[PDB]
C-alpha cells in the first residue's frame, strides 16, 4: 500500500511558522478545498506528504524532483500531518485523540526568548499523553542572529529536560527559505518510524465524517470517513458500527448498532482493497445513504461483529484538572467540579455534554446526552463553558 503509514502532529502556535512549515513539507501551494474534510468534533485535518531522498546526493524531501540537484527522487514513504484550527482545538484533539498522532513535531519560535505559554501547554500535553516521537522544529531563524539563536536553542534544551521531549532533535529551519528542511525531512524517518503494528489485531476505525456521496438531486451506500487506530479493514468485510442509528421508544431515545459491508476503501487518494492505521481513510459501505447523511455517524466506532468497545450511556471519571498558563487572570484557576454541571466531553473522535450526578474522590459521575463507544481507562478530554466559551479544564479517564 501506498497510504499515509504515521500521522505527525503539527504542534506549535496558530503562526510561528506552523502553516510555513506543514505547506513546506507538503508542497501546498495553491489556495484549500480540503477544509471541507476537517473534522467536526475535534477540528483534525489531515494533509498527506510523500518522503523520497534523491539518488543523486541522497538528500530527503517531500518532492518527485530534488530541490538540491534536481534530479529524480526515489519514494520512501507517504505520512500525514494533522492539525487543528487554534491552541483550544489543538489541546482538546491531543487529550481526546492521542491514537490518532503517532509522533509530532514541536515547533518553537526562534524569534521569542522565553517559551510561550501555549507552547508550555503543548509539551503539557504531550506529556499527558506519553507522545515521545517528537522532533522540535526551531522555526525563523533567518530573522535572528547567530547569537540570539543559539541562546534560544539552550532555552529549549532547559524546557525540555526531564520531558517527553528530553531527547528530541532541535532543528533550526527556516520554511520560508527552506534551509534545513531536508534535515527536518531525515529527522522524521529517523525518529518518527512506522511503528511495528499487528495488523491481526481486531479492527478499530473512529469516524470523524459520514457523507451520502450519491450525485446532487448508480447508487452507492453510505460513506464513512475517519482513522483506523488498530488492525484494518478489507473489501469485503462485515462491521459494525456503534453506538449507532438513534430511535424512540417510550418518549425515549436509544441507539441500535448497525452491521453493514464494506463495499470501498479510499486511502492516500486512492481505491485500495486493504486500509491501514495512518491518514484519512474512506469506507464506502452498503449502508442506506440516508443513514450517513449529514455526518450522522460522525464520532461512531467501528469494528468487526462481536469485537467493539462497549456502549456508555454515563460514565465513572478519573478527573485530573489541569494547571493551565493560557487564558485570563482568573481562568487559571480551575474552580472544582460540581454535581449538576453540565460539561463538554471529547472522547476518540466522540463528543457529547454531560450532566455530573455524582462526585468520589478525584472522580466524577456523568449522565451523557449522547452515548459514546469507548474502552475503559480511554482518556476524555473535560470543557466547561466559561463566559459563553468552552474551556478546556482537564480530562478524566474511563472508570468501569
Ligand atoms: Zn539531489
Same mark, same amino acid.
Given at each position: 500500500?501506498?497510504?499515509?503509514?504515521?500521522?505527525?502532529?503539527?504542534?506549535?502556535?496558530?503562526?510561528?511558522?506552523?502553516?510555513?512549515?506543514?505547506?513546506?513539507?507538503?508542497?501546498?501551494?495553491?489556495?484549500?478545498?480540503?477544509?471541507?474534510?476537517?473534522?467536526?468534533?475535534?477540528?483534525?485535518?489531515?494533509?498527506?506528504?510523500?518522503?523520497?531522498?534523491?539518488?543523486?546526493?541522497?538528500?530527503?524531501?517531500?518532492?518527485?524532483?530534488? +530541490?538540491?540537484?534536481?534530479?529524480?527522487?526515489?519514494?520512501?514513504?507517504?505520512?500525514?500531518?494533522?492539525?487543528?484550527?487554534?491552541?483550544?482545538?489543538?489541546?482538546?484533539?491531543?487529550?481526546?485523540?492521542?491514537?490518532?498522532?503517532?509522533?509530532?513535531?514541536?515547533?518553537?519560535?526562534?524569534?521569542?526568548?522565553?517559551?510561550?505559554?501555549?507552547?508550555?501547554?503543548?509539551?503539557?500535553?504531550?506529556?499527558?499523553?506519553?507522545?515521545?516521537?517528537?522532533?522540535?522544529?526551531?522555526?525563523?531563524?533567518?530573522?535572528?542572529?547567530?547569537?540570539?539563536?543559539?541562546?534560544?536553542?539552550?532555552?529549549?534544551?532547559?524546557?525540555? @529536560?526531564?520531558?517527553?521531549?528530553?531527547?528530541?532533535?532541535?532543528?533550526?529551519?527556516?520554511?520560508?527559505?527552506?534551509?534545513?528542511?531536508?534535515?527536518?525531512?531525515?529527522?522524521?524517518?529517523?525518529?518518527?518510524?512506522?511503528?511495528?503494528?499487528?495488523?491481526?489485531?481486531?479492527?478499530?476505525?473512529?469516524?470523524?465524517?459520514?457523507?451520502?456521496?450519491?450525485?446532487?438531486?448508480?447508487?452507492?451506500?453510505?460513506?464513512?470517513?475517519?482513522?483506523?487506530?488498530?488492525?484494518?479493514?478489507?473489501?469485503?468485510?462485515?462491521?459494525?458500527?456503534?453506538?449507532?442509528? +438513534?430511535? @424512540?421508544?417510550?418518549?425515549?431515545?436509544?441507539?441500535? +448498532?448497525?452491521?453493514?459491508?464494506?463495499?470501498?476503501?479510499?486511502?492516500?487518494?486512492?481505491?485500495?482493497?486493504?486500509?491501514?492505521?495512518?491518514?484519512?481513510?474512506?469506507?464506502?459501505?452498503?449502508?442506506?445513504?440516508?443513514?450517513?447523511?449529514?455526518?450522522?455517524?460522525?464520532?461512531?466506532?467501528?469494528?468487526? +461483529?462481536?469485537?467493539?468497545?462497549?456502549?456508555?450511556?454515563?460514565?465513572?471519571?478519573?478527573?485530573?484538572?489541569?494547571?493551565?498558563?493560557?487564558?485570563?487572570?482568573?481562568?487559571?484557576?480551575?474552580?472544582?467540579?460540581?454535581?449538576?454541571?453540565?460539561?463538554?466531553?471529547?472522547?476518540?473522535?466522540?463528543?457529547?455534554?454531560?450532566?455530573?450526578?455524582?462526585?468520589?474522590?478525584?472522580?466524577?459521575?456523568?449522565?451523557?446526552?449522547?452515548?459514546?463507544?469507548?474502552?475503559?481507562?480511554?482518556?476524555?478530554?473535560?470543557?466547561?463553558?466559561?463566559?459563553?466559551?468552552?474551556?478546556?479544564?482537564?480530562?478524566?479517564?474511563?472508570?468501569?
Amino acid at each position: 500500500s501506498r497510504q499515509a503509514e504515521v500521522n505527525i502532529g503539527m504542534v506549535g502556535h496558530v503562526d510561528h511558522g506552523k502553516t510555513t512549515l506543514t505547506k513546506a513539507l507538503t508542497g501546498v501551494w495553491t489556495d484549500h478545498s480540503e477544509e471541507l474534510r476537517r473534522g467536526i468534533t475535534i477540528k483534525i485535518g489531515f494533509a498527506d506528504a510523500e518522503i523520497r531522498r534523491c539518488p543523486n546526493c541522497g538528500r530527503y524531501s517531500t518532492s518527485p524532483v530534488c +530541490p538540491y540537484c534536481g534530479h529524480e527522487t526515489e519514494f520512501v514513504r507517504r505520512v500525514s500531518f494533522i492539525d487543528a484550527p487554534g491552541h483550544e482545538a489543538l489541546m482538546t484533539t491531543m487529550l481526546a485523540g492521542a491514537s490518532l498522532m503517532d509522533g509530532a513535531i514541536l515547533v518553537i519560535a526562534a524569534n521569542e526568548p522565553c517559551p510561550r505559554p501555549q507552547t508550555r501547554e503543548h509539551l503539557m500535553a504531550l506529556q499527558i499523553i506519553g507522545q515521545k516521537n517528537i522532533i522540535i522544529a526551531q522555526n525563523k531563524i533567518e530573522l535572528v542572529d547567530k547569537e540570539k539563536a543559539l541562546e534560544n536553542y539552550r532555552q529549549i534544551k532547559e524546557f525540555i @529536560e526531564g520531558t517527553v521531549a528530553e531527547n528530541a532533535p532541535i532543528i533550526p529551519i527556516s520554511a520560508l527559505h527552506g534551509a534545513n528542511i531536508d534535515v527536518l525531512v531525515k529527522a522524521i524517518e529517523d525518529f518518527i518510524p512506522t511503528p511495528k503494528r499487528d495488523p491481526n489485531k481486531p479492527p478499530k476505525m473512529l469516524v470523524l465524517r459520514s457523507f451520502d456521496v450519491n450525485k446532487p438531486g448508480k447508487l452507492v451506500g453510505g460513506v464513512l470517513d475517519g482513522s483506523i487506530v488498530q488492525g484494518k479493514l478489507k473489501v469485503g468485510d462485515e462491521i459494525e458500527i456503534r453506538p449507532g442509528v +438513534p430511535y @424512540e421508544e417510550h418518549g425515549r431515545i436509544k441507539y441500535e +448498532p448497525i452491521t453493514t459491508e464494506i463495499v470501498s476503501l479510499q486511502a492516500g487518494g486512492q481505491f485500495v482493497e486493504e486500509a491501514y492505521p495512518g491518514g484519512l481513510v474512506g469506507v464506502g459501505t452498503k449502508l442506506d445513504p440516508y443513514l450517513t447523511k449529514g455526518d450522522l455517524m460522525a464520532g461512531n466506532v467501528v469494528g468487526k +461483529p462481536g469485537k467493539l468497545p462497549p456502549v456508555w450511556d454515563s460514565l465513572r471519571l478519573e478527573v485530573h484538572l489541569l494547571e493551565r498558563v493560557v487564558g485570563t487572570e482568573q481562568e487559571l484557576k480551575v474552580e472544582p467540579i460540581k454535581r449538576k454541571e453540565v460539561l463538554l466531553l471529547n472522547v476518540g473522535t466522540a463528543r457529547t455534554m454531560g450532566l455530573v450526578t455524582g462526585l468520589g474522590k478525584d472522580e466524577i459521575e456523568v449522565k451523557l446526552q449522547i452515548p459514546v463507544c469507548a474502552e475503559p481507562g480511554d482518556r476524555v478530554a473535560i470543557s466547561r463553558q466559561i463566559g459563553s466559551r468552552w474551556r478546556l479544564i482537564g480530562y478524566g479517564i474511563i472508570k468501569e
